[PDB]
Symmetry: D2
Subunit: 341 residues, 4 copies
């Protein structure tokens, strides 16, 4: 069966594996290897215990065999024997011998086309960058929109940011119905590792500042991303992220100018249909009176709070929550399940 | 002097007094009484120490002259004797005998023209409701914009909300020079007192949940304010508000369609000229990459982040800060100062 | 099957009803009625949606009849039909009708014998205050310790606090082993409902203060309870509490003077043999480097951090974690099961 | 006059420079040089805008004379003309050319005896390690206790930690009245720079975990340091530290067995006395019911909460707050203004 490997057992990598076991439907593929620069013990711990998502529900047993290290993981009536590796520089990795079909490059270090091929130079067949693009990419995918539009000879694939997978669907759907003259996105976002616990030295003089005590307006790769997905949107959309002191779950505030005429009802109605039809696998809509932590550990790439939708004249605004760790995790998985086809 | 009194030594009332002593120019009106349902010591204790604004910078001793309790408040080369009262029902309050010129109603219970007038029956000359009008006000005022338009016959007046103080100048300033077709607002606001520390039974099931580790979107009455202030802007602007774990400071995220050519440079250039000339008292602008905490205890009704301004086509977004409690409190005083003809 | 009411559908009351379901051990009794000032719809929201413990996993069918309201609740293959009520005064409540074998008085408003007797007046056969007593109680129980001391005759009982549920084991185990001359307790508790979001008027001027941004030391009627439980430990034990801005999970820090030889190993080993034999049902011990978050939703009365134990001479210090809501909520049930005719 | 320089312009470094300006008493020495690996601009911004301590009241103007970068800071009727340096290797520093009498080491990378000496070999005339000793130093000092015992043979001087600056004067005062058989310290501390914002890989696995959402029991160098100043205390004192989600201000829970009769009264009475006589510059005491943010920006090396003092038999406990950035930093300034003839 298709063999997958994770480079970087960070938040993303860890949650991905967690998802594999937690996934309601067993993914046909299997993860057989994880690479990192840290000791296995540290990782296991972080995989086992998490402040956000909680104790991982199942045993994890390390075994040394020959000289190779292995995570025997069991959970949800499902096993994986993973091989651990401690190679800093990808190029030397043994993806060749392991017959690794798909690398999940989740280190955030090797985002470029050059640094991503290093995994292919190392004998892997297909890389997926678990972040926005840096320079070149053979395709910029958003499972639920253009996961089909992957050529087979594509090798360096990006699946963009968590933010981008809430934005792209909102935009596509609405442009396809009402038209979008120009849009503007505010993103209310939980904290991210990039920030500092206390005022520290940081390039981002904004993210320099105490994560827990500040509202921090900053930027989002998610615009430049979506412009690679919908190159026509170049010079029509913009926006930014705001960081506030919650641990997890984020929102989008999408203001836009419709080209056809719009009512509140109408916009909400469309988004409800869309969530039951084409985008059923990654969208959901809620009227109920909810707040971020209700959407924690929610595998949708976005949920629309419909009550939040507003309209004055041509101008409108919609609101979507999304677990900014866990949606984007199941989308790295859901995409890998699309390649067997 | 012209004599002012406070009803409700709440988060506002206390800050108003603090501001009276902390303001760089002394006001030509004394605060001669306060009144609250809570014990004097509790009030004093919270007058002296504040989690958001640290210690009060001076002395407070409690005299019992006659049968009457008194506060004796020594700070920044200024003194006040201040009679404490403890009457729920504001019609009993002896504003008559104390010869109160102006009340500030700062409890939140008495916002109807009806309820508020009870201070005038108690023998007050004038009342300011420190809150968006409940039903009617002889006028509704935002210092720096329309404060002038108070007539002598005007008896019940509202100083609206912190949001209103920052949302209105932005509209007047932009709408005049550029022309707002429609505009939408997103208010990122710190925790509010009416919230719940853990999840709790409450009318609003959004503002029922854990204030400190939860994002909660909800309503802003600073729209239903703005419309009494600017009648022209009815159906041209709606918006909503978001609670986030910080303890103070808030942001307005204004997003508007223009009836003219708009560049980022030209928007910011206006907002600057407006702060330099027409609104130098209640406005300011910052080029610097600052965050919420940096504007704590800032007296300006709005500080505009110019590196947050954004243009796509005829649509745009401006970004302004304000200390909710302080920005609003200094405007309260600035107002009572203005009635001296 | 006995029949159990819950005056008070707050953190405790609600998490009681949950644990009944989420528990793998099935209780021979059933919960058949709840009461609260709030209206059914609101209780149901909050029963389903919790910030701390997350989405309730089950369906909740609100049934209205000619006057009576019910709650059909389905989860973990278990089904309850639960009458809802809205009556402030527990004297008038119809426990008579419904054959209430036990009330769980989880409001924290009826803690005297007289106020709790209002439930016996209403027709309930037996009460239990879900707090420390306020005066007379026909016993004060800590499950796993003196739950068999329940006299048949005993009507009004108390189940002390979560804090006391943890302190007492420790004391009893150590004293009955090494002998405790005197011992002091430092409790690090997460925010609680009594606390305020911002500085508000309150009788306890420690708890008046903004809960999110303050280390707030204070009282703890765990001691006053521990004395009612272990009478011989009068005068020898005192302690206090500290509120810090986590949402949940507390820790207890007991420094004691032993009346015999003590060494870290022996201290820990003792607690290990306890968590393995006698107290093994409400106790557990962990060698691992954990933090508060990971014990969130843990059913144990105490979990001892054995890496934290220290000894200098005849004085030593042990350390335990506990979930304040869930630890307590499970024990309440366990005690109800203890009452078997 | 003596000429001070700062290696490491971090939390400590920058607060040190700030304190210089704020002190009512113009110190009899000037800070003439700072050094950081980071870029000047960042260093200014952070020195100007702080989340913990607010805006620096003054103005900084960067000047590049010749090929040297200077900082012209003006505040509180004073000016310093600083030089900024980008030299990571201390041996290569120009302390000799700058005629530096005192380097403040605050990088926390050069705590070792050898490494700190690297400064002296650069022409430094005396070095102060702004941390507990790593290996062994010429002398460990606690201003207000033993700041007189400095010899001119002493060139490597450790100012211990913000914690030790409060632990020592308690222990000293208490042993030297009632005696201390043994004693155990619990420390509740605000968050530190070294913690992670989200769960993360790090050497210590408890400081790996999310700073804003956990109580985190860990360790404290303060005992190791106190023994190098009170060697008699070896074997007679231990303790640990806990990190809670607050920005600043920490407290200490000293529990101790007395060697005489003690009553709560006498203990508080001694500490009141001590705070007026000998330890009057570095100590204070409060009867009031106060909380962390009350003592933010408070230059006392400790303050006792006397309401918190407890007694059972020979065992007693006390409690004291301290600003763990501000206090420590004025002690650095107080230590440098001892050395003057
Ligand atoms: N050169 C590298 N090769 C492989 N994994 C790496 C490398 N550098 C960092 N990592 C991992 O990438 C992750 C960093 O992302 P995060 O920890 O989520 O901020 C951690 O799991 C690191 O161990
Ligand atoms: N009937 C009343 N008359 C005057 N002040 C009141 C009354 N009821 C409550 N207050 C005060 O109004 C304020 C409302 O809460 P807050 O403004 O958030 O502090 C508090 O100071 C209350 O103690
Ligand atoms: N008179 C009452 N009878 C029954 N339950 C009550 C009464 N008053 C308040 N409660 C409930 O008790 C709860 C207090 O516990 P907590 O939610 O932890 O603050 C409130 O949320 C109410 O739902
Ligand atoms: N010579 C130096 N070598 C290494 N780090 C330095 C040096 N000078 C300044 N720094 C940095 O200054 C920072 C200030 O401390 P902090 O920001 O609290 O970690 C430290 O992180 C150091 O790395």
């Amino acid at each position: 069966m298709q063999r997958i490997a994770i480079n970087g057992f960070g938040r993303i990598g860890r949650n991905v594996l967690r998802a594999w076991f937690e996934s309601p439907k067993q993914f046909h593929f299997e993860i057989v290897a994880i690479n990192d620069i840290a000791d296995v013990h540290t990782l296991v711990h972080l995989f086992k215990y998490d402040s956000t998502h909680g104790r991982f529900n199942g045993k994890v047993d390390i075994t040394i065999e020959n000289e190779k290290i292995y995570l025997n993981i069991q959970s949800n009536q499902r096993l994986l024997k993973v091989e651990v590796l401690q190679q800093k520089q990808p190029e030397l990795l043994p993806w060749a011998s392991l017959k690794i079909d798909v690398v999940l490059e989740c280190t955030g270090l090797f985002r470029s086309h050059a640094d991503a091929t290093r995994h292919l130079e190392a004998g892997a067949k297909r890389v997926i960058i678990g972040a926005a693009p840096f320079d070149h990419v053979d395709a910029a995918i958003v499972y639920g929109v253009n996961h089909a539009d992957v050529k087979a000879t594509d090798q360096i694939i990006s699946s963009v940011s968590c933010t981008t997978q809430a934005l792209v669907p909102l935009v596509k759907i609405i442009d396809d119905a009402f038209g979008i003259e120009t849009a503007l996105m505010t993103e209310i976002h939980a904290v991210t590792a990039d920030q500092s616990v206390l005022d520290h030295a940081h390039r981002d003089l904004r993210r320099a500042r105490a994560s827990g005590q500040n509202i921090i307006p900053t930027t989002s790769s998610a615009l430049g991303a979506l412009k690679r997905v919908m190159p026509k949107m170049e010079d029509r959309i913009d926006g930014y992220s705001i960081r506030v002191p919650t641990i997890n779950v984020a929102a989008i505030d999408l203001t836009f100018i419709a080209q056809s005429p719009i009512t509140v009802h109408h916009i909400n109605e469309l988004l409800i249909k869309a969530s039951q039809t084409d985008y059923a696998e990654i969208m959901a809509v809620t009227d109920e009176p909810l707040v971020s932590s209700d959407f924690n550990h929610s595998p949708y790439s976005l949920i629309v709070d419909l009550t939040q939708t507003m309209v004055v004249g041509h101008q409108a605004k919609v609101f979507a929550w999304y677990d900014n760790e866990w949606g984007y995790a199941n989308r790295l998985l859901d995409l890998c399940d699309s390649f067997k086809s």
